[PDB]
Symmetry: C3
Subunit: 181 residues, 3 copies
């Protein structure tokens, strides 16, 4: 037993969990969020930031920034936030070439802090992406990733949970960065 | 990440999901079902077909047949249906030599349409077979299969779900084909 | 399909399930328990044994002993029991060198009898250890183990379940064996 290695998805956790953050109002805990790029853009659910006097974001490595709302799309309950990149921001691994398949193992990473991670599969490929991984306020707005750590979706609320396919989330983010809502 | 392959049970989905079908009344959605053989026999739960004026079955590939009730067993809540085989029916993979073991990974495949798939293990080998895979109306009457795609059980209703061991389901089906109920 | 082997965690079940036992009052079913050593010591939840006129323990191999309460810690809801070792007691595999990581696959083994086993991962490493494996009265007081079979925690009550890290459980047990509560 000692020589052999336990089955684990910790690899995906190490690669992806650093990029998932807390999101607060100023002090209340709103929900989770995901760092998408070095520029300092962050995706979260619209309902999380719907009534925020001031928005604060907290990484797992201890850093704490203030975020400004870039914009939101009601239809997808998504919202993009912006923060100053110190130089060295942890970003969510993304693979635009990866094709999500039904039955793929997925971890739902959320940060209501500690950090909570649940495991499931893709029930139905994205309409949105379905998974039997628990999706709750604690991980709403966080990332859904495969065993590799590659972003599959953004966890959203409202036995089956829902995430927004990463391809669509990318596109919505871009269009929100350029135009606004 | 791009070079490497995600952990997935999609293999089992491709092998088994084609054989799981919808079941309707004529238009209401009754539940799920499983194609067992080329002859055109289909297992579903008795409660699904309990009050059907007319029974319709819908495959994932787009075909739609009418089904006639062969018979049912109250004790197992099972029911066998019959449809004309076009020539080329997708059937549920079965291995009579395979011995289900506790801890075996299993996918519960149901078709309330899209098609919903959940993942778990065998908690207790069949009394019936137990699994922590979600078993709900959406997948009641559908198939439970291992990572290979081999039929383990027929999902049934009434944290733990229940499926009827494929060995018993086979036997009950045969006896219903010969005698009736 | 027949040549190939199903994905399974049955290995861990065979190695660990023998050591998980039933716990009764004398006849009511109280909960689950875990055999820790050849001496005949057994960990269970304090709430399970809180009001026991007489305590009985039942192994999976058919043997039935009476147990005496060594002591308990309210804070961890743990309780150590003692039974005469026949010679050949099945004990829960323990690895003091093993470091539990987030994302590790874990089976929650409980014995409300049959024996119920559920699967999940470590959401948060132990405060206590979190897992999305179902933790219910049926498996409260039982073992949580990895794919190897190595004890990770003692399942406890009160979408996320809780287990007491095996390192802490070991220490609490020792201190209860020496002093009492």
């Amino acid at each position: 037993s000692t020589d052999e290695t336990p089955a684990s998805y910790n690899l995906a956790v190490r690669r992806a969990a650093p990029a998932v953050v807390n999101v607060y109002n100023r002090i209340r805990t709103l929900g989770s969020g995901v760092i998408m790029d070095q520029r300092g853009y962050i995706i979260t659910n619209k309902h999380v930031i719907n009534d925020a006097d001031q928005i604060i974001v907290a990484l797992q490595d201890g850093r704490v920034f203030e975020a400004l709302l870039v914009g939101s799309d009601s239809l997808t309950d998504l919202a993009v936030l912006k923060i100053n990149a110190t130089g060295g921001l942890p970003t969510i691994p993304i693979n635009a070439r990866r094709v999500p398949h039904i039955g793929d193992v997925v971890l739902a990473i959320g940060n209501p802090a500690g950090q909570t991670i649940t495991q499931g599969i893709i029930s139905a490929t994205g309409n949105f992406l379905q998974t039997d991984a628990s999706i709750n306020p604690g991980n709403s707005g966080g990332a859904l990733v495969n065993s590799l750590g590659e972003l599959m979706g953004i966890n959203t609320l409202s036995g089956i949970g829902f995430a927004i396919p990463f391809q669509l989330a990318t596109k919505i983010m871009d269009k929100l960065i350029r135009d606004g809502r």
